[PDB]
Amino acid sequence: AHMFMAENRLQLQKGSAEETIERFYNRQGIETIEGFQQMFVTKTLNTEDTDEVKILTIWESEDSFNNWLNSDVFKEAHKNVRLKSDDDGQQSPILSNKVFKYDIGYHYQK
Amino acid sequence: AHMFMAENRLQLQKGSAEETIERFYNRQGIETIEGFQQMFVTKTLNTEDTDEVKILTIWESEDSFNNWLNSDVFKEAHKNVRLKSDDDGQQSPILSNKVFKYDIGYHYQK
Numbered sequence: 026a027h028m029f030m031a032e033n034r035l036q037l038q039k040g041s042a043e044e045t046i047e048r049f050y051n052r053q054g055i056e057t058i059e060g061f062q063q064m065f066v067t068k069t070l071n072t073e074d075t076d077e078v079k080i081l082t083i084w085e086s087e088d089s090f091n092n093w094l095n096s097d098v099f100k101e102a103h104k105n106v107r108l109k110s111d112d113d114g115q116q117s118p119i120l121s122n123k124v125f126k127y128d129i130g131y132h133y134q135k
Numbered sequence: 136a137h138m139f140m141a142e143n144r145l146q147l148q149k150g151s152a153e154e155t156i157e158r159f160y161n162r163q164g165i166e167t168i169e170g171f172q173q174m175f176v177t178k179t180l181n182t183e184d185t186d187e188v189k190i191l192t193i194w195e196s197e198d199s200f201n202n203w204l205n206s207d208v209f210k211e212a213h214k215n216v217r218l219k220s221d222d223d224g225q226q227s228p229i230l231s232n233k234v235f236k237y238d239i240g241y242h243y244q245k
C-alpha cells in the first residue's frame with residue numbers, strides 16, 4: 026500500500042513568506058490523526074513577484090488525509106485563517122491557495 | 136541554516152508514470168552524500184494528458200545537494216538517462232524535466 030502526499034500551495038504577497046511560515050510552528054491537532062507521518066513547510070527559491078509557501082503532508086494513505094480533512098482539528102487549525110480575497114481578509118498576505126495530491130511510489134529515509 | 140529540498144519534475148507521456156517510478160527503486164549512491172536525508176518519488180493525481188512524476192530530495196543544507204550534483208555518483212546514476220528529444224532517446228517517455236529548490240522553514244515527523 027502506498028503512502029500519500031498532500032500539498033497546499035500558498036501564493037503570497039512579496040516578502041510575506043517568513044511571517045507566514047512562522048504561523049505553522051505550533052501544532053493544532055494534526056499529530057493526533059491516525060496515519061499522519063510528516064509535515065514540511067517550504068519557501069520556493071526563485072525571482073518571482075510573489076512569494077510561494079508550500080505545506081506538504083505525508084500520510085500512510087489517502088484515506089488518512091481525508092479523515093483529517095473531515096476532522097474537527099482541521100477546522101480548529103483553520104478557524105482564523107483568511108485569504109486576501111475574503112470579505113474580512115484585509116490583513117492577509119495570502120492571495121490564493123491551491124491543493125495538489127500525490128501517490129508516493131517510493132520513499133527512502135537515512 | 137535550514138534544511139533544504141530539491142525537486143526534479145518529470146513531464147512524462149501519458150501512461151508511463153509506473154515504469155518511470157520503478158527506475159528509482161535501485162539506489163545509485165545519493166545516500167552516501169553527507170547531508171542527504173530523504174528521497175520521495177511521487178505521481179501527481181490529476182486529469183491532465185501527460186503524467187507527472189516528482190523526485191523530492193531532502194538535505195541538511197543546499198551545499199550538500201550541490202555536492203551531490205557535482206559528484207561521481209550523480210553522473211553514474213544518470214549516465215543512461217535520455218529525454219525523448221535526444222538523438223538516441225526516441226523510446227524514452229520523459230518529455231522534459233524542471234528543477235525546483237526550496238528552503239525548508241519547518242519540519243515535523245511523528
Ligand code: COH
Pocket residue numbers: 031032033048049051052053054055056064080082098102103104105106107108119122124
Ligand atoms: C492539503 C492540506 C491543507 C489544506 C487543504 C489547507 C487549507 C488552507 C487554506 C485554504 C483553504 C489556507 C489559506 C491555509 C493556511 C493555513 N493553514 Co492550512 N491547509 C492544509 C495544510 C495545513 C496543515 C497540515 C496545517 C497545520 C495543522 C495542525 O494541526 O498543526 C495548516 C494550518 C494552516 C495555517 C497556520 C495556522 C494558523 O494560522 O492558525 C495557515 C495560515 N494547514 N490552509
Ligand code: COH
Pocket residue numbers: 141142143158159161162163164165166174190192208212213215216217218229232234
Ligand atoms: C534535483 C535533483 C535531480 C536532478 C537535477 C536530476 C536530473 C535528471 C534529469 C535531467 C537531465 C532526468 C531526465 C532525470 C531522470 C532520472 N533520474 Co534524476 N535527477 C535528480 C534526482 C534524482 C535522484 C535523487 C535519482 C536517484 C539517485 C540515486 O543515487 O539513487 C535520480 C535518478 C534518475 C533516474 C533513474 C535512474 C536510472 O534510470 O538509471 C531517472 C530516469 N535522479 N534526472
Ligand SMILES: [Cl-]
Pocket residue numbers: 033080
Ligand atoms: Cl496550509
Ligand SMILES: [Cl-]
Pocket residue numbers: 143190
Ligand atoms: Cl529525477
